[PDB]
């Protein structure tokens, strides 16, 4: 059948290179719709 096994558990997760990501904080509910109003309804 398939050439998988329990010995390959998570093989791809340890194969991707580790690229650090920037820190990020998300907006409050009021600031989100201010952003969406400015970017969709406006130009």
């Amino acid at each position: 059948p398939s050439h998988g096994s329990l010995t390959k558990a998570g093989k791809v997760r340890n194969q991707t290179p580790k690229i650090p990501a920037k820190p990020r904080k998300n907006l409050t509910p009021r600031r989100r719709n201010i952003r969406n109003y400015k970017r969709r309804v406006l130009y």
Binding site: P1, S2, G4, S5, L6, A9, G10
Partner: protein, 144 residues
């Protein structure tokens, strides 16, 4: 083939008996009324249960797909029944060991039965030793 049947003004009692007779043709109604969910389900009517991992066993995906979905065999504490529980996530089986308490929970899918390409498995692991497996996999916590 004509005039549905007990349509009289004073046919209320007979009409109610006839409609109750054919409710049993509905599998959903018969299961709920007969207490079949809480007699054959290993979780025993609960949404989740505890268990002890015994052996890491691998089930194969159905014919069109090709893979070895990595599950584990669990024995429920409250019943002693042995069930196969799917361990999700990439590398999630590596956070599992032998003889560790895991919280067993339904895998979803139609009607509480198995999921898409995984044949004959109804449960998935959510907690390992009292900590959520998604938390360990995301790094937000570490296994105890």
């Amino acid at each position: 083939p004509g005039k549905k049947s007990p349509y009289g003004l004073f046919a209320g009692g007979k009409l109610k008996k006839k409609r109750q007779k054919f409710r049993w043709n509905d599998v959903t109604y018969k299961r709920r009324m007969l207490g079949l969910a809480e007699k054959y389900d290993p979780l025993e009517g609960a949404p989740m249960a505890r268990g002890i991992v015994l052996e890491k066993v691998g089930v194969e995906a159905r014919k069109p797909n090709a893979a070895v979905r990595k599950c584990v065999r669990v024995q429920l504490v409250k019943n002693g029944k042995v069930v196969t529980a799917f361990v999700p996530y990439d590398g999630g089986l590596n956070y599992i060991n032998e003889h560790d308490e895991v919280i067993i929970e339904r895998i979803g899918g139609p009607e509480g039965k198995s999921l898409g390409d995984i044949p004959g498995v109804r449960f998935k692991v959510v907690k390992v030793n009292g900590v959520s497996l998604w938390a360990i996999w995301r790094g937000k916590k570490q296994k105890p």
